Design a protein around this ligand. Structure first.
Ligand code: APC
Ligand code: MG
Ligand code: NA
Ligand code: ZN
Length: 357
């Protein structure tokens, strides 16, 4: 029987139901934009469970026994079976508010509030936003507009690997024992991504050395002429705090959101200016919390949400990116690997490429 939890399902990139899930993902995204959190969650859980199927839905009978498929979702599936299209998702794709929110938030530095502001000012195109002489932009948005075309072309694996080399070269210059791991979508087997994320940890670094690494690495890149954008968020990590109770848990580790200059010569692929702007995120965590951070930063977002929901509701455990706490035993559970976290939770291990929920 298919579990309602993504953490009890294997979700690989061979999606046989893309016709259904692309429509459900559009409807979920629109509900996010329309601030309808409930309808958003229902469409996300339905899309997620269909992504896990080893076969394509070809009739309504095929949906029997599948959880997270409410009556509204079943009407959408029925419509796609009928003529290969979702009339509901088609209407969202042609909606002016939806088109504007997608287009405006595609700019690095633009969120829901700024996209809503620009829409209510009557803006519909990025050309009209950029050329407006009254608008004031944040430093993040200026970088978002300046490197727009590069950031909107999604990063491929040769580029992600070339970025990994740059990150490792910079990091070991200051911490030679540091462990650097590529996380996010690329770790889950994806061919492309909007950014490249890394988890950095050191078994022998001090609390101060751990704090200074992201500043040293970004200053080195600034000197090199490779740092196009940099925002370092200092740690708010608390060694003895209980893990988050929130639906979507916040990460308190030291991190940085960057834009790097990636020279074409560094990319070893099959194939203008000779460089590409790449979004890069670096996370530094204490060595003892590396398994929890890796598990949280690997994703997918739906896999993480269901992991934390399963931990709470089924095991009376509290899980987040920093720790795992057992409310019955009144102890924090230690882990040196993701496999140990899954074993603590009573879950069969799900490989990173199986977490595409
Ligand atoms: N501030 C944050 N706190 C905790 N976890 C975060 C986070 N930002 C990102 N993540 C997590 O790390 C994974 C990577 O984040 P993102 O790069 O934003 C999406 P992705 O899974 O890598 O596909 P994508 O890079 O093409 O968008 C997420 O899927 C999520 O699990
Ligand atoms: Mg990512
Ligand atoms: Na954005
Ligand atoms: Zn990221």
């Amino acid at each position: 029987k298919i579990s309602q939890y993504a953490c009890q399902r294997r979700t690989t990139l061979n999606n046989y139901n893309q016709l259904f899930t692309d429509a459900l993902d559009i409807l979920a995204e629109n509900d996010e934009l329309r601030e309808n959190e409930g309808s958003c969650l229902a469409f996300m859980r339905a899309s997620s469970v269909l992504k896990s199927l080893p076969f394509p839905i070809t009739s309504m009978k095929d949906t029997e026994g599948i959880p997270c498929l409410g009556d509204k979702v079943k009407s959408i599936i029925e419509g796609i079976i009928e003529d290969g299209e979702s009339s509901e998702a088609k209407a969202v794709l042609n909606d002016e508010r939806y088109k504007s929110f997608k287009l405006f938030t595609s700019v690095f530095g633009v969120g829901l509030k700024t996209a809503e502001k620009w829409f209510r000012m009557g803006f519909r195109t990025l050309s009209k936003i950029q050329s407006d002489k009254s608008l004031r932009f944040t430093q993040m948005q200026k970088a978002g507009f300046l490197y727009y075309e590069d950031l909107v072309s999604c990063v491929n694996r040769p580029e992600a690997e070339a970025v990994s080399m740059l990150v490792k070269e910079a990091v070991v210059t200051f911490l030679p024992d540091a462990l650097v791991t590529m996380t996010g979508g690329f770790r889950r087997g994806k061919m492309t991504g909007h950014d490249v994320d890394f988890l950095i940890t050191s078994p022998e670094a001090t609390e101060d050395e751990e704090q200074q690494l992201l500043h040293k690495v970004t200053d080195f890149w600034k000197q090199q002429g490779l740092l196009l954008y940099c925002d370092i968020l200092e740690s708010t990590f608390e060694k003895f705090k209980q893990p988050s109770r929130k639906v979507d848990a916040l990460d308190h580790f030291q991190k940085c959101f960057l834009i790097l200059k990636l020279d074409h010569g560094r990319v070893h692929s099959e194939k203008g200016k000779g460089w590409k702007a790449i979004r890069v995120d670096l996370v530094m965590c204490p060595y003892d919390r590396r398994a929890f951070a890796l598990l949280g930063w690997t994703g997918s977002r739906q896999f993480e949400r269901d992991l934390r929901r399963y931990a709470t509701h089924e095991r009376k455990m509290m899980l987040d990116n920093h720790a795992l706490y057992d409310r019955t035993k009144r102890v924090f559970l230690e882990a040196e690997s993701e496999e140990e976290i899954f074993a603590h939770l009573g879950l069969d291990y799900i490989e990173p490429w199986e977490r595409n929920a």
